[PDB]
Amino acid sequence: SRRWFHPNITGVEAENLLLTRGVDGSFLARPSKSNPGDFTLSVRRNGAVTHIKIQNTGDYYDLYGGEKFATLAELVQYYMEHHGQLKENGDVIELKYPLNCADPTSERWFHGHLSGKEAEKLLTEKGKHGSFLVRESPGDFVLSVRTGSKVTHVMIRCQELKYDVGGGERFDSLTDLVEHYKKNPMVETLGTVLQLKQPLNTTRINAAEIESRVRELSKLQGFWEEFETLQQQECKLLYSRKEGQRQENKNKNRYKNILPFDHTRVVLHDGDPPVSDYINANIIMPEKSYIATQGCLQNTVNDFWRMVFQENSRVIVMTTKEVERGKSKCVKYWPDEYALKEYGVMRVRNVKESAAHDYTLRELKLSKVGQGNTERTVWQYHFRTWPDHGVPSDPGGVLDFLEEVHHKQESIMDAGPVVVHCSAGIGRTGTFIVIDILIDIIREKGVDCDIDVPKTIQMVRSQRSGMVQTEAQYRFIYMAVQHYIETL
Ligand SMILES: COc1cccc(-c2nnc3n(Cc4ccc(C(=O)N5CCC[C@H]5C(=O)O)cc4Cl)c(=O)c4ccccc4n23)c1O
């Protein structure tokens, strides 16, 4: 589980939680209050609490004295499985016991302040057999289910810090109660089974009414509460990343612990006749395809081109500068303008470069060496103006770029997936892919369609780890879709 994350606690509350209710090896994670956008990993080690900083400017989670990761669940799973890796002075910190949160705020089914009539309305319009929710009653709670068709309300009593349905077991949290009756459903006298199948959808909005949702999420924030509910669903996305762990593939990853899922990785068949099949790249299939990948390493430039050629990709979206903050984000994998270069068995020519305000377009020609008939044009769209930290203050530039990328891809008959990359290939990459997926819904289906932003992100996140990194990018995605519909 992801119960070790406590969204609404202070460093003091965290210290007292570990020192009174935990042991040596106990830990929890929490958002930082001192600098929002950041996280803190509080660990109990020899009767004392250590608070460790986790940073995310949009590319990955960067734990002080540790490594860079795609999700907090990936970070926690790693350090709990691989010991001696986390260090203070250099003292080996061990994560042994997650100290669980009882706060139901980040749960999909928790609604807090809500009326039984409004809960009945939502379950009537947006609900199906098994749809349920938990809301505040006088210090008590209410479980409202849909069965068909009807709505049943079950009182949840709060007696001396424990929860019950009026008999049987007394739970230490609403989640323990909810989970219990999910596995062991309450049966009504006349045989009705109160099936807790799925939480009620609170995120799907009609495209045309996005402005109303943006306003509502901008009220004390709602964006933060919505994002942290999506974040909580990331414990379901811990798929294997075994291939990316192989000795032979270690130097093929830009970040040691940010790996591609095995079930979606782009497998390379070109094959020089040992382990010629790996690239830190994943296929992104909506519900037009993409490949989400990292910025090239000097040793992966060749694999990059074997992939572009294999997949029949005709468009590349680069969302980083080669160098940001004095650090190399992506090596130059393309030739200089008018030059011709050989990258292993692959040959590329930079025919022409066009510089627009927010980006450069490079017309590339790709072919396999010794076969002239294999030649195809690859359009490289390189976004140059993304801030080193955070998101652009206005989404127009990104929307204009994405519009051009869209129409180029659309004009090319039988073009393979769109290649999208930044540094790690999870934050800016995930942001551009998600904006593009949602704005494609409003392209085909028009302003009258239904859009569900965290449903889309979760779907993309099961395909590559940590796709869309921060709450800032998440807000940017809302702001981008809203600007598209406004200019429609
Ligand atoms: C259906 O579920 C799944 C089924 C099968 C595999 C996985 C799976 N895939 N990745 C991981 N990781 C990430 C990871 C692991 C190792 C290294 C690594 O470099 N190695 C290798 C040499 C030294 C060692 C080391 O660094 O100590 C780096 C990373 Cl990021 C974990 O932690 C992990 C921990 C508990 C269980 C599965 C894990 N799991 C899985 O999720």
Side-chain angles (χ1 to χ4, degrees):
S1 80
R2 199 183 197 248
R3 299 287 298 256
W4 43 260
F5 191 83
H6 299 227
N8 313 296
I9 65 156
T10 83
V12 155
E13 296 183 310
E15 205 142 2
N16 305 337
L17 263 162
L18 289 165
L19 297 169
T20 67
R21 301 220 93 256
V23 294
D24 279 339
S26 281
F27 72 97
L28 65 89
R30 43 182 195 89
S32 283
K33 294 269 186 192
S34 77
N35 192 33
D38 296 335
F39 300 95
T40 296
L41 180 46
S42 317
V43 190
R44 192 178 148 162
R45 191 163 153 78
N46 289 116
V49 170
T50 294
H51 299 263
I52 315 158
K53 201 170 193 271
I54 303 149
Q55 260 208 68
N56 207 325
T57 66
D59 315 311
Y60 42 71
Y61 289 98
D62 191 349
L63 174 70
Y64 172 81
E67 272 284 339
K68 292 156 177 154
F69 294 85
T71 84
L72 292 178
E74 281 189 3
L75 186 150
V76 173
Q77 180 199 52
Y78 176 83
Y79 289 119
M80 276 187 82
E81 180 62 80
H82 311 97
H83 279 146
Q85 220 79 250
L86 186 53
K87 285 166 228 83
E88 270 164 49
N89 42 315
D91 289 343
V92 282
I93 324 153
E94 281 179 4
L95 305 194
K96 289 182 137 69
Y97 318 100
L99 196 151
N100 296 325
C101 188
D103 189 359
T105 45
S106 301
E107 301 278 350
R108 246 132 59 79
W109 41 256
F110 192 67
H111 293 235
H113 193 75
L114 198 79
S115 87
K117 275 120 75 184
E118 170 75 347
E120 231 178 283
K121 185 205 184 191
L122 300 162
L123 279 160
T124 310
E125 39 215 47
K126 291 125 202 181
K128 64 215 237 71
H129 173 85
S131 302
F132 73 96
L133 54 85
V134 181
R135 55 160 190 97
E136 288 176 20
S137 198
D140 291 5
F141 293 89
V142 188
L143 191 125
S144 308
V145 227
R146 221 239 206 202
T147 45
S149 272
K150 56 149 169 178
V151 172
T152 305
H153 309 272
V154 183
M155 278 300 313
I156 300 173
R157 282 200 84 172
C158 194
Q159 301 179 75
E160 241 290 284
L161 286 121
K162 280 181 208 218
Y163 316 86
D164 62 83
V165 295
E169 297 310 300
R170 292 175 68 237
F171 306 91
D172 289 317
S173 69
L174 286 183
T175 307
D176 291 330
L177 188 152
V178 173
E179 268 323 297
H180 177 271
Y181 295 109
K182 219 156 145 77
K183 281 178 202 72
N184 309 285
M186 302 168 297
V187 197
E188 285 194 307
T189 64
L190 284 156
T192 301
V193 178
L194 300 173
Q195 221 103 261
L196 313 186
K197 276 192 176 82
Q198 56 279 308
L200 172 93
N201 184 304
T202 56
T203 56
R204 182 179 57 238
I205 39 155
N206 168 270
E209 70 179 25
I210 189 127
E211 212 169 291
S212 166
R213 194 48 67 96
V214 171
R215 201 177 302 115
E216 195 72 16
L217 290 176
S218 302
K219 280 196 272 186
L220 289 100
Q221 233 136 338
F223 275 116
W224 190 91
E225 238 216 273
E226 205 174 80
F227 190 65
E228 284 314 305
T229 304
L230 164 70
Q231 300 298 85
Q232 189 189 268
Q233 284 170 88
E234 86 191 8
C235 41
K236 305 211 179 155
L237 312 175
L238 294 153
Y239 309 125
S240 68
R241 286 100 68 214
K242 294 194 171 132
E243 287 301 307
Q245 285 170 39
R246 286 167 66 83
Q247 177 61 54
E248 300 111 324
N249 295 324
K250 278 165 181 179
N251 67 341
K252 304 190 190 140
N253 298 313
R254 185 175 271 287
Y255 308 94
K256 186 204 167 287
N257 308 323
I258 295 165
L259 306 164
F261 290 148
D262 293 318
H263 77 295
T264 53
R265 72 176 188 97
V266 172
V267 199
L268 308 179
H269 301 284
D270 270 86
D272 183 9
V275 43
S276 53
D277 81 331
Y278 184 88
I279 192 155
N280 194 308
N282 297 95
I283 292 290
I284 314 297
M285 286 235 71
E287 216 201 301
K288 192 227 229 104
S289 253
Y290 318 80
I291 295 169
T293 195
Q294 64 170 26
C296 299
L297 289 159
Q298 45 142 346
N299 69 288
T300 69
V301 174
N302 286 8
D303 297 325
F304 184 77
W305 288 113
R306 279 171 68 211
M307 175 182 70
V308 173
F309 185 97
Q310 191 188 275
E311 298 291 312
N312 202 23
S313 300
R314 315 297 186 86
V315 180
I316 304 157
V317 160
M318 181 169 179
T319 63
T320 194
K321 283 189 193 69
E322 283 148 56
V323 177
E324 279 173 14
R325 291 178 37 84
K327 291 165 248 169
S328 170
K329 294 304 157 220
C330 179
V331 310
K332 174 143 173 301
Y333 55 90
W334 61 93
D336 290 344
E337 202 183 16
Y338 312 123
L340 175 67
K341 209 167 176 193
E342 284 183 19
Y343 297 104
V345 302
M346 298 295 157
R347 193 188 265 140
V348 195
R349 185 191 304 279
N350 185 342
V351 181
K352 202 67 196 68
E353 297 191 8
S354 320
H357 186 248
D358 289 285
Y359 71 98
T360 312
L361 164 65
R362 301 182 180 99
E363 181 173 347
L364 310 168
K365 243 62 158 174
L366 168 64
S367 62
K368 204 180 164 167
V369 171
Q371 282 136 221
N373 212 77
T374 66
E375 199 205 287
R376 84 285 312 278
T377 309
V378 178
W379 300 93
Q380 201 226 352
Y381 283 91
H382 180 185
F383 203 90
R384 291 178 339 250
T385 63
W386 193 279
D388 298 343
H389 297 327
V391 295
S393 24
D394 160 70
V398 152
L399 292 167
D400 285 11
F401 175 82
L402 237 36
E403 205 64 8
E404 217 28 59
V405 166
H406 180 73
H407 289 133
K408 184 66 79 180
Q409 176 75 352
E410 233 215 300
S411 79
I412 311 153
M413 187 63 69
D414 306 305
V418 174
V419 179
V420 191
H421 71 85
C422 51
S423 59
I426 61 186
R428 285 169 207 196
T429 301
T431 307
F432 279 70
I433 288 166
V434 171
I435 295 170
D436 200 73
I437 288 175
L438 303 170
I439 271 159
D440 225 290
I441 300 156
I442 310 147
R443 248 183 235 289
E444 186 202 27
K445 295 174 178 162
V447 99
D448 288 313
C449 65
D450 273 346
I451 64 158
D452 205 331
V453 176
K455 208 214 209 82
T456 298
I457 296 160
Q458 186 66 13
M459 182 263 295
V460 162
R461 280 192 190 166
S462 63
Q463 290 186 88
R464 186 174 173 87
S465 327
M467 290 288 272
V468 186
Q469 284 288 299
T470 60
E471 189 241 277
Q473 279 159 0
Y474 188 78
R475 183 191 247 81
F476 188 74
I477 300 164
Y478 265 103
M479 243 40 107
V481 173
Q482 182 196 222
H483 190 114
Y484 190 81
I485 290 152
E486 265 193 32
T487 64
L488 202 67

